Amino acid sequence: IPRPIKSSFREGLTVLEYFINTHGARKGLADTALRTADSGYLTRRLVD
Amino acid sequence: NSVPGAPNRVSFAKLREPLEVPGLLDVQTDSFEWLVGSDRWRQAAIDRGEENPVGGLEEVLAELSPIEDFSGSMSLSFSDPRFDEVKASVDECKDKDMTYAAPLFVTAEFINNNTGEIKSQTVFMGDFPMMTEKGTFIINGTERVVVSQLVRSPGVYFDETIDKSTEKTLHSVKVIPGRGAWLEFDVDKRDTVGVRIDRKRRQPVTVLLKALGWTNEQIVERFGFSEIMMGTLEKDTTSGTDEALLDIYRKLRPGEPPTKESAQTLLENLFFKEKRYDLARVGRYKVNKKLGLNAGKPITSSTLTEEDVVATIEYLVRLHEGQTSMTVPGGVEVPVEVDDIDHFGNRRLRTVGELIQNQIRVGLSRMERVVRERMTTQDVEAITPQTLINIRPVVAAIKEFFGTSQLSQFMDQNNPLSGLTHKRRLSALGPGGLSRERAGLEVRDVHPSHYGRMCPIETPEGPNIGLIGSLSVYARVNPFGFIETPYRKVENGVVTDQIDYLTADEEDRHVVAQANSPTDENGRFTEDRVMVRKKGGEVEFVSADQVDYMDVSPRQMVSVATAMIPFLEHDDANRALMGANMQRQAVPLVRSEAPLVGTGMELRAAIDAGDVVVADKTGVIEEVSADYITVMADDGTRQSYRLRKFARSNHGTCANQRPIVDAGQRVEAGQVIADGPCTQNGEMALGKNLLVAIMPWEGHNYEDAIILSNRLVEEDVLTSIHIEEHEIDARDTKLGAEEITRDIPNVSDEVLADLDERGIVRIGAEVRDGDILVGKVTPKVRDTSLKVPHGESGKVIGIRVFSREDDDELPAGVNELVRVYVAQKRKISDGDKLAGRHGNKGVIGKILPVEDMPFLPDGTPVDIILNTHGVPRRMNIGQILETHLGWVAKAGWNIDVAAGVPDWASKLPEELYSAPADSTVATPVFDGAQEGELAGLLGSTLPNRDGEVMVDADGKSTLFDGRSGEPFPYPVTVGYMYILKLHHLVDDKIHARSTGPYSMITQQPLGGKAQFGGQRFGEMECWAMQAYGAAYTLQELLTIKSDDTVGRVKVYEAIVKGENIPEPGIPESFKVLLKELQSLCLNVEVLS
Amino acid sequence: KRLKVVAAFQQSGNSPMGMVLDAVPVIPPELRPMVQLDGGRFATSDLNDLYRRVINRNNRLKRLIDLGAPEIIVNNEKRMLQESVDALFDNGRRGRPVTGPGNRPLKSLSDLLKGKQGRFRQNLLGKRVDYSGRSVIVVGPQLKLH
Amino acid sequence: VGGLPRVQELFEARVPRNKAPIADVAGRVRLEESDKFFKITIVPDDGGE
Amino acid sequence: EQDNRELSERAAADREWTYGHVVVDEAQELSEMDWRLLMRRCPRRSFTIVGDLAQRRSPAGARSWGAMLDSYVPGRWVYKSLSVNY
Amino acid sequence: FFDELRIGLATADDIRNWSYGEVKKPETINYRTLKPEKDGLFCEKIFGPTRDWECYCGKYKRVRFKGIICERCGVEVTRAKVRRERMGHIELA
Ligand SMILES: [Zn+2]
């Protein structure tokens, strides 16, 4: 997003800044089971 | 304020809220009102909108009336639904294990078209589960909540999908009603338009057009702006309507012979007959807004017509050809544009009302059938409607939705906020929704259409991430089902006070400003590069007269648990998410205390939820006890409120209420008369303010663990009450009848100490695992008594006993029922979980005596020690600021304005210039305490009892070690933080097993905390163990401990006797498998 | 594809004469248990039924072959025996299953060690190990690594 | 993006998407190129094909 | 599987290909069936036919344009000329 | 002890050998008196006894003498644990 966040968590993000920073956060909390599953699949193979 | 009894809670807010937060659970009540045509809703509609306000029952009964047969000699209609008073109150229901319902009535008229004789007859439709003032239902005694479902709106949805084989663009459309068949058009790589009906084999759309009575001249007139369409015309082996109707009937009804009339009536009663196909009213709205049809004109009732099936194609072509406009012949201009699926213009909300409507419709369809089938085989001139009618199906639908549905959920009664967020919850899963297969990662995303409509933070952390959500605070719900949020209106660069609620599509064709934008004395603007959001979720600098709207507050997108977080813009979304979902799991304490530093959002949450008691009418407190409050009002009437004492929730908590008013007091209306489980003077108190030191102690606060004083146990600060329910039924049996009594086969004579004459334990008696609560028997005779499960213990509160004889109510096969309610006061031990409102939790490692805690130069010990290592890599510093302000409050302040307000109190009100101790304050999430103000107020910080300031102007206080007595060489950040005790306790999460109950279907332990089952030993553990080379322990786990039977016996014996453990024989998973291959005549042999 | 089944019996100490059966074994009861229920009802598997069917057909066929009866009824009952035994081994593979009370196919012997409810897949999963517990962990730095 | 996909692409002996051709022989190269295409010819050092 | 051959090659290896435009120089040397093929190739009918009937060496030829085109693009084809010679 | 596992085709002699009898009746139990029937299924003579150390005759029940075949019922008296480790055959017509 070419609009950056020119504020820190010390100054305090504005409302929009705090809105466009939820996207990647939720992407992470979502992906962080598929990642585990892929690793486990590779490991299951390597073990078999 | 706007609340009569308003504990003064000063605010650092620098703006004025031009719009008071609405009722927070209206999303439920308004919808249930639309369903029963209540007069409030009827006028609310008439007051703005339409002229005939049609309800939600009226609507089904109209879309059902009249029930005719094939001939029409007779007809049977329903109308004018009525709701006569409820039988019993909410308490009477929650106690008698009964539902909160009202008799429903509807007039049923019958005609005899041969004669024409009316036989009007009022009817009894059933007892209809009604809805409480709190936004709930009460089903069979338990309190429930009908969550709202997110779905995709009916309509016509275009698309574009780069092709795979050829890397070619190719468009598609799709018409999706509430009921009917899916009609899809496409443009493929061969550049030939096509169609599919009931998702069947594909066809040239020209087939459909001609089937609709179109001649190639008509087509060439309408189309012809596109050569692909002319080509689909030429390259077609079916000319003439009837030939095309036969084509459709063939690719759609194979084996049955084509008949002219059959095909005509098929294409008629597939889309255009409003019995097998209906775009619900929202569907028609969406399909007219798009396509520019039926402009400025009713949407009363309709289904698919021809103009829409044709403008769909014109839109598809005009879009393939890459255009930005379409002006249908008669319709209006419209932008050509692909449709986003997760956009809220396209997604919509089924509220409790619509769900119940649908299930009532289902029951009514069953009733309609059953009516017909007894409407041919009866004697006319005799049949009233109450003969043709069997209401049973209806009730079942009702009783099958308020039970056996994934949207009627047991209420989250762990604390007021948990329920309040349960009721404002949006689900994208359930009957009619989706599942974890289709549920990918774009429905679980945040979309720029959620601003003011859905919270981008509140949602679970695991497999329900992004699907479940929570509705914002300033948002409401269109009658269609689309969520609206308010915006201030702006004219000529200056902002008015006219509030206009917008749904997304409207929001998208405007330039929307930001609340924190400056103004001066008028709402006018003083900057020029105003920050705005544009259509495509985009944000940018723009001019002044160029804004078409404005936001009311900064907290328009946040929710009700995320707005009770101070210093949010200083935390990160993950940790704020976790804080929110933590507050929502927080037990009620024996004594509640409100945040010394909070947000202007706890009072209103506590009111709207409903675990408090508010003055119905202004008046004067006549009498006050702990079980009753009595107000003699100003009009002469005497209201009498009753209080729930030690009331078990659905989660073991306590719902005790306690008054906060004294006799003779004069209360307004809207004033809090009693507090709840987690309120103090009407504002959420889910936790405690505790004196915290930010420092690493001697390794006992390592990796997120925490350290506590023992004053939090001595003074039962973080102590909770937990109640639990134990039920036993006494039913009949062949061998005999179960009779609950005191006497029992040979057992002790003391165990019957706490048992009264009836065999049920005696109140005020303390109990212990294995001890008896109530005595039941199955003949032989047997000892079938109820005993406390392992761990749980406490004192007998209550006994709720139901008997066949007394005739209260019971199920089938059962004759008697006893519920026991036993309580447990739980002080904060080690292993328990704590947290704060910023995503900072941790188990308790060490509970330290007060004399070894880091104490201050006042003698004041700290109460909790938190480590420095988890703060700066998690971005949850909002707790540091919280801590500082907590100090600033517990120890008041006075800015010295002798020479004038300093350069950092400029923006401050004239009410924060000073404050005494214990001075609660408010730092709203995005209009709150800045950092200069806080650094300055850390210096004022009135001295103590002895004229000394224990804390510097940086938040740091020199401390002393209670073990060495020597001071720590470096000053330490100290303050007061608001923390919370979580349902994740110890006793309810601890387990252990040596040998107990096994399955008897698999030869394994009955795996479960309730069945006293052991832990599992999966594949990965076996892998690790094999990688150690450990081979006798692995065999010990897989044979001696789980499945083997003689092995378990012999090992228990060998250990209880003291003889070395026997050695394996030959695997018993082999001594029998053999005896299966010797059965298939396989000569499996084992050899050396 | 055809050379394999022949090169097998080329060296296999055994010849293909086992594909054809002249005796058939039975399992030990504890694999076909039949137990009353706690209240008067019964609970069984469906292998005793298959063996009973086989044995009925076989004894009747024995008779038909002692009674000098025509070749046709002997032939018919022999087809029936083949069908019944093939069912017992793997009912549901060839043609139509042999349904039971509930129009359910009777669980054959292949259906005893094939699926995850099968004697092979078992012991490759979690077993609910006794002499075990679980709790919540806190930190002790007054401790040693062992 | 050569992470877990590449590991799965190797331990399973799969032909890669961006496959590169290798030299069946030693020697020198004659490199020609035309519109959107390379053509290499390996003249060996032994004196063969 | 994944060979993402360039457009020229992915196309020329397929007669079931729909182009987006078609140039034809010395187009008088073509036959009714040739144009049938071409117009089965481009359904968008976005041709740029060049030619000169009086430069024809073919006994299938055109002898006029409307002959071969009105069967595919009647009244919807433009005829421009280039009169000067330099 | 175990070193390898061989699997192969069974002959009729292998099945005649694995066995301890030859069942002939289509009888499993007596639904009335709840007892396995003779020369049928769940029999005690070729699969072993059900109650431990007692013959289906129920006479030579004491364990003090082991390794005898009660002539009446034919049930060698021993541990019932064999009813898992015991097979029989059927010499099909
Ligand atoms: Zn005997």
UniProtKB/Swiss-Prot annotation, chain A:
Superkingdom in the source lineage: Bacteria
Function, as annotated: DNA-dependent RNA polymerase catalyzes the transcription of DNA into RNA using the four ribonucleoside triphosphates as substrates.
Subunit structure as annotated in this protein's UniProt entry: The RNAP catalytic core consists of 2 alpha, 1 beta, 1 beta' and 1 omega subunit. When a sigma factor is associated with the core the holoenzyme is formed, which can initiate transcription.
Assigned protein family: Belongs to the RNA polymerase beta' chain family.
Descriptive protein name: DNA-directed RNA polymerase subunit beta'
Source species of the chain: Mycolicibacterium smegmatis (strain ATCC 700084 / mc(2)155) (Mycobacterium smegmatis)
Part of the intact protein present: 831 to 878 of 1317
UniProtKB/Swiss-Prot annotation, chain B:
Keywords per UniProt: Antibiotic resistance, DNA-directed RNA polymerase, Nucleotidyltransferase, Transcription, Transferase
Effect of Q409 to K/L: Rifampicin (Rif) resistant
Entry's Gene Ontology molecular function annotations: DNA binding; DNA-directed RNA polymerase activity; ribonucleoside binding
EC number(s) stated in the UniProt entry for this protein: 2.7.7.6
GO biological process: DNA-templated transcription; response to antibiotic
Lineage top rank: taxon: Bacteria
PROSITE patterns assigned: RNA_POL_BETA
GO cellular component, one term: DNA-directed RNA polymerase complex
Pfam family, one: RNA_pol_Rpb2_6
Effect of D412V: Rifampicin (Rif) resistant
Catalytic activity: RNA(n) + a ribonucleoside 5'-triphosphate = RNA(n+1) + diphosphate
Family annotation (NCBIfam families): PRK00405.1 (NF001616), rpoB (TIGR02013)
Its biological purpose: DNA-dependent RNA polymerase catalyzes the transcription of DNA into RNA using the four ribonucleoside triphosphates as substrates. This subunit often mutates to generate rifampicin (Rif) resistance. Interaction with RbpA partially restores Rif-inhibited transcription; once the subunit is Rif-resistant however RbpA no longer stimulates transcription.
Protein name (Swiss-Prot/TrEMBL): DNA-directed RNA polymerase subunit beta
